[PDB]
Amino acid sequence: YAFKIPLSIRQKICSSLDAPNSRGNDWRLLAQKLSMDRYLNYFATKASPTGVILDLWEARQQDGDLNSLASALEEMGKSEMLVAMATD
Amino acid sequence: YAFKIPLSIRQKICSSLDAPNSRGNDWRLLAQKLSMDRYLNYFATKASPTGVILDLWEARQGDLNSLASALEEMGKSEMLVAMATD
Amino acid sequence: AFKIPLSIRQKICSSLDAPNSRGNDWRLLAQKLSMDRYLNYFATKASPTGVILDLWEARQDLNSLASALEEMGKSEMLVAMAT
Amino acid sequence: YAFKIPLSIRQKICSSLDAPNSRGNDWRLLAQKLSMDRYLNYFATKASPTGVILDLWEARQQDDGDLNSLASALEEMGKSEMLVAMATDG
Amino acid sequence: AFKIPLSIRQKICSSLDAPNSRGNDWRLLAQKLSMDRYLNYFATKASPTGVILDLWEARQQDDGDLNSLASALEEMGKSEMLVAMAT
Amino acid sequence: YAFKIPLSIRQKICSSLDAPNSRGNDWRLLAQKLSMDRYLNYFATKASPTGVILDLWEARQQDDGDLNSLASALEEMGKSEMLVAMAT
Numbered sequence: 001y002a003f004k005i006p007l008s009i010r011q012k013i014c015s016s017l018d019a020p021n022s023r024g025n026d027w028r029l030l031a032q033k034l035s036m037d038r039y040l041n042y043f044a045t046k047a048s049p050t051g052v053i054l055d056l057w058e059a060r061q062q063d064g065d066l067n068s069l070a071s072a073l074e075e076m077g078k079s080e081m082l083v084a085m086a087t088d
Numbered sequence: 089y090a091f092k093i094p095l096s097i098r099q100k101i102c103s104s105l106d107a108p109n110s111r112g113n114d115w116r117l118l119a120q121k122l123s124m125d126r127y128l129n130y131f132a133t134k135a136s137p138t139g140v141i142l143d144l145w146e147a148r149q150g151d152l153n154s155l156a157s158a159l160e161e162m163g164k165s166e167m168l169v170a171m172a173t174d
Numbered sequence: 175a176f177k178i179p180l181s182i183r184q185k186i187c188s189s190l191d192a193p194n195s196r197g198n199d200w201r202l203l204a205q206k207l208s209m210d211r212y213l214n215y216f217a218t219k220a221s222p223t224g225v226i227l228d229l230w231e232a233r234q235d236l237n238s239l240a241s242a243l244e245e246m247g248k249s250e251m252l253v254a255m256a257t
Numbered sequence: 258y259a260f261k262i263p264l265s266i267r268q269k270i271c272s273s274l275d276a277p278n279s280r281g282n283d284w285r286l287l288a289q290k291l292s293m294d295r296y297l298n299y300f301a302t303k304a305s306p307t308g309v310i311l312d313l314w315e316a317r318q319q320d321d322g323d324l325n326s327l328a329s330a331l332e333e334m335g336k337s338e339m340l341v342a343m344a345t346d347g
Numbered sequence: 348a349f350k351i352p353l354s355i356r357q358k359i360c361s362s363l364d365a366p367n368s369r370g371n372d373w374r375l376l377a378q379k380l381s382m383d384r385y386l387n388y389f390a391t392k393a394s395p396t397g398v399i400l401d402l403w404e405a406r407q408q409d410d411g412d413l414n415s416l417a418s419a420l421e422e423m424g425k426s427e428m429l430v431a432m433a434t
Numbered sequence: 435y436a437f438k439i440p441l442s443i444r445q446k447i448c449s450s451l452d453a454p455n456s457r458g459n460d461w462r463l464l465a466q467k468l469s470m471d472r473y474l475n476y477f478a479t480k481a482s483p484t485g486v487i488l489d490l491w492e493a494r495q496q497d498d499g500d501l502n503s504l505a506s507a508l509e510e511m512g513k514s515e516m517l518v519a520m521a522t
């Protein structure tokens with residue numbers, strides 16, 4: 001789109017959040033941090049819910065940066081992910 | 089339980105609105121009506137732009153009346169009649 | 175070689191050089207990045223951190239700096255870097 | 258810091274090792290011999306790459322014994338004249 | 348009457364007094380300081396390097412330095428000593 | 435030592451030269467005449483400086499070792515008496 005998440009980062013965020021997490025700290029939390037909590041039931045049936053979430057996120061950007069994504073992962077305590085993004 | 093657009097109605101809407109329309113009376117207008125147009129770029133990359141819009145709309149939903157109203161505003165009277173008739 | 179953005183470098187140095195940051199300052203960062211052997215040198219500079227960051231850049235491990243900040247609770251700086 | 262290299266000696270060491278005419282026997286070799294080659298790029302940015310290497314060295318100066326790495330370095334670089342001056346002065 | 352700081356002498360003496368495997372001891376030092384003709388006398392006391400340094404001191408001007416000594420130790424490859432002096 | 439001074443003479447020379455006098459005719463002059471003036475400070479440290487001087491003098495003697503250079507120094511110092519005393 002007018003903006004795209006670099007592939008290596010998208011892949012890491014997805015591998016990390018797609019896995020169902022007993023305590024709610026999976027893609028569901030990202031969806032809530034990006035104000036897409038109303039659509040949870042739609043992402044739930046996709047092979048990669050995190051993938052759909054990030055596509056929608058990209059679609060609504062202008063040519064912006066990864067600040068709101070980095071910042072959401074931060075509030076989720078996804079420390080390693082943050083490091084991962086900076087590293088690349 | 090949860091709100092669900094009956095499949096036959098989803099398919100009917102998709103076949104009518106996914107089709108090419110010089111006037112723009114298609115999924116793009118439906119998206120605006122359903123307050124989903126912030127994501128038109130995403131919808132465009134899909135096989136059924138309308139299927140995705142309806143699925144997301146349903147999820148955030150339970151009244152089909154809001155949908156009918158959108159379609160009525162779009163002049164899709166022939167479609168509404170075909171649906172009612174089946 | 176590589177280079178940390180100036181606005182980021184500025185927030186790092188401001189925080190870690192501060193004496194009110196004792197216990198979570200340049201000394202900790204130096205240890206976390208394996209430059210403990212030169213603590214005494216950093217100490218003679220007005221900005222211990224600026225030098226630490228210069229050595230780190232030269233030694234380029236881009237993961238190590240971000241991991242150190244994360245471990246030091248510097249979330250905003252980390253977000254700035256992920257961005 | 259426990260021992261400071263005298264200024265006159267520091268000046269001549271830097272004059273020699275910073276010199277481009279000393280390639281093959283300059284600050285780069287000194288850094289490697291002092292186990293600091295990991296930071297070569299940092300030393301290159303300095304007006305005096307040798308001056309900074311020596312500041313770092315002086316910093317590691319814990320107690321008599323660490324001073325051997327340097328002396329050994331000068332000797333191996335043919336700069337013994339320099340070390341003869343350090344044993345002659347505080 | 349010039350003098351050598353105790354510590355340094357203590358070091359150098361116990362470092363050279365002990366006979367070295369290839370003659371690199373107070374003996375060689377003697378030759379470097381041109382006291383060749385006196386080895387027999389040095390080899391007649393508690394610490395050989397002791398008198399050698401003693402003779403050297405007395406020879407040094409009232410305001411001299413350990414230059415010629417350090418220089419001797421340099422050609423003998425005694426950096427180990429050119430550091431203790433430095434410190 | 436390629437030569438040793440008879441203790442009889444040694445004790446004689448030392449008793450005569452260790453005593454300081456206003457003639458400058460003591461161990462300091464002997465040291466000078468034997469080319470050892472540069473070590474004056476050292477000798478002054480010993481109980482018997484003349485003894486030390488004689489030790490160094492004995493030490494540098496070659497095979498032909500002869501009291502000659504020593505007797506000669508004494509002669510130039512106006513000790514001709516002590517010379518025949520050594521002649522005995």
Ligand SMILES: O=S([O-])[O-]
Pocket residue numbers: 021023024025
């Ligand atoms: O188990 S995790 O959500 O910390």
Ligand SMILES: O=S([O-])[O-]
Pocket residue numbers: 031032033034035036037038039
């Ligand atoms: O998270 S809410 O805005 O759907």
Ligand SMILES: O=S([O-])[O-]
Pocket residue numbers: 104105164166167
């Ligand atoms: O758009 S059509 O189905 O009336």
Ligand SMILES: O=S([O-])[O-]
Pocket residue numbers: 109111113163
């Ligand atoms: O394309 S028609 O429905 O205006």
Ligand SMILES: O=S([O-])[O-]
Pocket residue numbers: 277278280
């Ligand atoms: O000056 S050197 O590169 O031959």
Ligand SMILES: O=S([O-])[O-]
Pocket residue numbers: 439440441442443
């Ligand atoms: O050494 S002599 O005087 O018997």
Ligand SMILES: O=S([O-])[O-]
Pocket residue numbers: 465466468469470471472473
């Ligand atoms: O008298 S001088 O030759 O030591």
